[PDB]
Amino acid sequence: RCNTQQPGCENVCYDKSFPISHVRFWVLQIIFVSVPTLLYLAHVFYVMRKE
Amino acid sequence: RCNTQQPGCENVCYDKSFPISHVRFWVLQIIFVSVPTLLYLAHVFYVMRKE
Ligand SMILES: CC(C)CCC[C@@H](C)[C@H]1CC[C@H]2[C@@H]3CC=C4C[C@@H](OC(=O)CCC(=O)O)CC[C@]4(C)[C@H]3CC[C@]12C
Ligand SMILES: CC(C)CCC[C@@H](C)[C@H]1CC[C@H]2[C@@H]3CC=C4C[C@@H](OC(=O)CCC(=O)O)CC[C@]4(C)[C@H]3CC[C@]12C
Ligand SMILES: CCCCCCCCCCCCCC
Ligand SMILES: CCCCCCCCCCCCCC
Numbered sequence: 001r002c003n004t005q006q007p008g009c010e011n012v013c014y015d016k017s018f019p020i021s022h023v024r025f026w027v028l029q030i031i032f033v034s035v036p037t038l039l040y041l042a043h044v045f046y047v048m049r050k051e
Numbered sequence: 052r053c054n055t056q057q058p059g060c061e062n063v064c065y066d067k068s069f070p071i072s073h074v075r076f077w078v079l080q081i082i083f084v085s086v087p088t089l090l091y092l093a094h095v096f097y098v099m100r101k102e
Contacts, residue, residue: 003056 002010053061 005054005056 002013053064
């Protein structure tokens with residue numbers, strides 16, 4: 001909430017204050033941190049099949 | 052009118068903008084300008100009665 005009667009001020013002020021939410025930032029962080037292990041697991045699986 | 056949700060801001064802002072209204076200022080001005088002639092008329096009336 002904001003103290004004003006001007007329509008649209010709340011939207012822009014919220015956007016400026018929070019360009020991106022913390023939760024989604026952390027979701028992206030964990031996904032990026034986790035993907036390399038998945039890649040390594042897939043590579044090891046295929047290598048084991050070939051061997 | 053003012054653009055805000057704060058209660059009491061309109062009262063103080065109006066008071067600051069207009070410490071005194073123009074109409075009442077002009078009423079005071081004309082009364083002050085006119086009183087001396089009334090005083091002179093009364094003085095002349097009493098002097099004429101005495102004479
Ligand atoms: C926690 C770990 C120790 C066990 C749980 C994960 C594994 C079971 C993962 C590691 C790599 C995965 C594989 C990596 C890639 C593929 C993608 C996908 O490949 C396809 O068939 C693509 C579809 C197509 O061929 O058109 C099917 C699942 C599979 C075999 C995955 C099956 C599950 C695997 C073996
Ligand atoms: C525009 C001009 C030319 C004419 C119109 C005004 C006059 C009629 C004025 C000028 C001075 C005035 C006088 C000035 C003072 C007094 C106050 C007052 O005096 C009292 O009797 C006070 C009461 C008391 O004695 O206890 C009565 C009206 C009177 C005589 C006024 C009556 C009307 C007068 C004569
Ligand atoms: C979004 C991707 C970021 C870069 C990830 C780098 C992963 C490196 C390990 C890949 C191992 C698989 C080799 C075949
Ligand atoms: C509020 C009063 C302001 C001063 C007025 C001055 C008037 C002068 C004339 C008086 C004449 C009567 C003499 C008896």
